[PDB]
Amino acid sequence: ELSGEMVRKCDPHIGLLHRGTEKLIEYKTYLQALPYFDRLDYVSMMCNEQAYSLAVEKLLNIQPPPRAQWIRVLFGEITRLLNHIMAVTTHALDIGAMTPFFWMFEEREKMFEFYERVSGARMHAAYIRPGGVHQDLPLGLLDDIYEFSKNFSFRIDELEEMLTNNRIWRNRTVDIGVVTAEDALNYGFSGVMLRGSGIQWDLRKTQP
Amino acid sequence: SRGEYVVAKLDDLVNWARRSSLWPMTFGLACCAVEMMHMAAPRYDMDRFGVVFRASPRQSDVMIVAGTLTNKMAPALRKVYDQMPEPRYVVSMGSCANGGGYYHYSYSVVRGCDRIVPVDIYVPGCPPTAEALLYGILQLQRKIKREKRLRIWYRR
Amino acid sequence: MNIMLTLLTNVTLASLLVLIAFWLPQLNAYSEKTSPYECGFDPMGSARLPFSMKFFLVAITFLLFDLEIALLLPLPWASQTNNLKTMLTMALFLLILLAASLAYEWTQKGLEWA
Amino acid sequence: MFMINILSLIIPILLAVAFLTLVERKVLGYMQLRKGPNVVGPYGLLQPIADALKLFTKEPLRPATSSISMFIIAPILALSLALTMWVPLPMPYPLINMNLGVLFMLAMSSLAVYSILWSGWASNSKYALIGALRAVAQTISYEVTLAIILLSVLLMNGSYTLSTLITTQEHIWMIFTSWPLAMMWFISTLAETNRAPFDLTEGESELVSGFNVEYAAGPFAMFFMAEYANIIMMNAFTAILFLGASHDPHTPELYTINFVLKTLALTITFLWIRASYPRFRYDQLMHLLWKSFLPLTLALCMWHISLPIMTASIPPQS
Amino acid sequence: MELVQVLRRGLQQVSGHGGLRGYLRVLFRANDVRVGTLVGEDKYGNKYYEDNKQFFGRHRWVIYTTEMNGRDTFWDVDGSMVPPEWHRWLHCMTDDPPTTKPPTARKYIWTNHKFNVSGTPQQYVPYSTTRKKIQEWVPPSTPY
Amino acid sequence: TYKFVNMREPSMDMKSVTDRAAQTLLWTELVRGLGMTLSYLFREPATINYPFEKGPLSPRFRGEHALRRYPSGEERCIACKLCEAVCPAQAITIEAEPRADGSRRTTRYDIDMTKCIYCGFCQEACPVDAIVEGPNFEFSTETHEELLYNKEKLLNNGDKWEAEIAANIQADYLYR
Amino acid sequence: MWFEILPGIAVMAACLFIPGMATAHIHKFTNGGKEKRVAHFSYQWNLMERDRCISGVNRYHVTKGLENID
Amino acid sequence: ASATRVIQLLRNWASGRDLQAKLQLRYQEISKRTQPPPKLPVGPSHKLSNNYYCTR
């Protein structure tokens, strides 16, 4: 409900992409349900797979092998890089930047290639499963990941150059969407939504 | 016949214009949209082929149904397809769009976008790789190249 | 007459283009295709209902400043007078009055919206 | 033979607009680590023609709620006005030499705005109405500062005749004299042409397509052609006003080449800005122009009024 | 200057493709005028080239044949035209070309690769592969 | 453990004030962004010339399903139906009967390429390596029915792609 | 690479160049090999009309010099 | 890359960084597609004695 272009009331209508995932999981075995979690958040598939695997392992009272755990943490951080690339670049594109999107999506393609080499699926791999990881890293993947990581910082710096200090970008975002820390906590916000307000909470540190 | 030759050449020109300039509408439902963006990304840039994403349905020529089509979203998809001017072509991307895929037996999923809107090219995969989507788009371009509207007009 | 001929030629080209666009293509117009566009779902109300203008004051002030734009355009020929002192004084008087008006509206929270 | 001249101005300009679309697509792609259109024709040369053919062979839809008369009139007005504004420009010799060509261009630019407002209102769609209101706000923001900057710069010319700008800048570019006014003028031209970072009327990210959301096929092609032609024409106006060129009366081709190159550079700058910067909020655009550009323009207008007097440099009226 | 060297390289590209006619042919067919080492050519006619200097993803490319399986492919080319043996080399699954490392020879393996046949009379049509489950009674042919 | 983004205070010395004033009036940062875009203009584009150039893929790629054979020519499938059981989307329909030789073979093997999620299961699950997701990804069709594969279609795909499938399995069989 | 952009720019540049050259040469052809006279004030138009009268062919560009005298 | 020295200088100056050192496009630095066969290690439970499943 807009008076002019001012939003008097914003009412989100959802369910346009409700596929009954939770109902379907009940009809599937634990392994069969694993691919569902990849689809829940298309941008961050492996992290959802890891969350499901952790839940199933805790119920199973079984411990993943250490190399499996380190592979999970590594690919989770790669998934975080993908997710944040998508979020920041699509946010800029919606506010009109439209170049960092392509710039960073090239790197997203490279990280997809890492996904494909490990699993054979560029996205939605079933790599992380309860009890560990399906297959060991193909030989040569780690050095390629090193090659990518050594250069990724320059790309992030160029994106900052495009957006961080721009007058227009700062105007579009500097004081929009302010959320109080207490309001953020009560409303159930998590992650950067809480940390942006100044609350110091990251489950990776508080609850590794 | 000279008339047949003129009709064939004009049909060639029209089909070339339509296939060379294919403007998909900015319609992405689900994970398959991400592979579509990667197709728009530099590696497989679709702008080289003349495929430019245009938001307005009336300024678009192709609808790519990327992602699962829920029963809630189906009327909006049909509305967007109808509001799209013709000639209009529909490409169904991903198993979810093609036949329902992982959520085929869900209450809230349409078991294929063919039920709601006519589909020209089906791109298999879940998610289909960006190269697969580009292959499907080029296949649609060849399908347009094979069209014989003016020849049929002359023969009718 | 040259300007009239040029205007006619341009308008005729545009009208011919519109005619060719509305007659060369094939059409299958049906109700759902010609319905209004509301991002897929149907519109709630009309698009002819009132649309509040949060910058009305700025628009009226724009009219009043376009008047000053009109008053200042003769300045290039004014600089050709022999009484350049009076001309300069009056031109700076008008520009300072425009500046004063802008400053007043600004300080009185008139250039802000809503 | 004047009709031949009118066609010579019109037809080549439209082809220039068509190839400008290709140039923009390729320049943005290369600035984005991509290759612009290359498949259709050698190095993508035939892409424009394919786009024009596709649009004009596509069904045009008349919205059920639309006011047909204005809906059709608006694209005609936009294209005709876009073509008309090219007439007074000296390249080097103008097609129509007017004593007050600059005011003519200002009035014609004012008239073109109604095409956007009429299109948006006739569409009878909420997004189109929002785009039309944004266009109204944009004109409110930019018109006064544009006029004041043009007056300040033309005070040195001594007239509103476009042709006399060449003589005034015979020895030096006027950008050296008035580089701040030049900066504000370039931004104001960006605003007038509704180009990024001020692409508010269309505003695809925020408004699905803005005023043209309900336009398809030929009318949309006409709106696009008007937009690009206005971009080129405004950049040419900037080149004439500030980046003057040498004119040898016996050989006009040299001036024409220099002018065309400068205008191409300015249009490329337009595409460059569209690629680089994000989009402004229309409240922010109006605030920028009224609170920042307008006071500096008033001060510089006072300065440019005084300077010819205090430096005994009043330009000749004739 | 390096600019003169670049122009000379462009002329070398013109010569390497067989002259102006070959240069234009390649430019129109594939939109790329690079000249690269010819690793091999399949039976269908597709020629495969390698330029390791070019960055990954462009080091290997294939020039599709003008005629395959009775279809004119001078303008209409498709990815499926690539035979399986060269598919892994082209897609970088392997670093060894089929010529250097031939695939294992099996009788059942097809000898002629078919491209995507959708939209053609050879298109696959689904059908049930199982026989009728329930058999009905056949009425006697005598009146009684 | 925690880092402060923002939380920096600008200097108030005349030089810093003049620098920030120049940035505001002279648009320095926008010019820096423009320079970045120009540098990208002069960098080599990343577009690959598809179809002539194809993107990298690994031997573990999951594409079109295929039914393999033994070197003899006998079909590897032994109608275990465990690969049907593990299918997350129930995209595989299998029926079997003792064949004339007496062997356990599949009378019906159907994979609906429209219900499949290309998970890669039943390649791990199938005990005899019979069913394999091959390298092919460009199997788009103009009709929905073309994507409902049959045992004949799957066996034809296996025969078509066996040369590549065997090499990829050889490459990745030790990792499995 | 970036040079591939240049051909479209060249086509656009030629299209833009056509108008000014066409205008100049058309003016030359219509006005007898000389630039079209600029009449921004009534005096110059009066001069043009007087030249039209003097020429005898009702064309102002036709210039009669000392030869016509005496 | 294959850029001429002039273009390299122009791009580096425009960026403010040495682009040549870190290039987004991938060259011979990437790992070879064909790799030596692996020998994956076995896990803790691969023992012939004292490995009764009740313990683990």
Ligand code: SF4
């Ligand atoms: S087909 Fe697969 S990738 Fe595409 S939307 Fe459905 S689950 Fe996501």
Ligand code: SF4
């Ligand atoms: S491996 Fe494949 S063919 Fe063999 S029994 Fe299992 S599903 Fe059937």
Ligand code: SF4
């Ligand atoms: S790879 Fe295909 S056949 Fe195998 S389980 Fe997944 S969807 Fe079913």
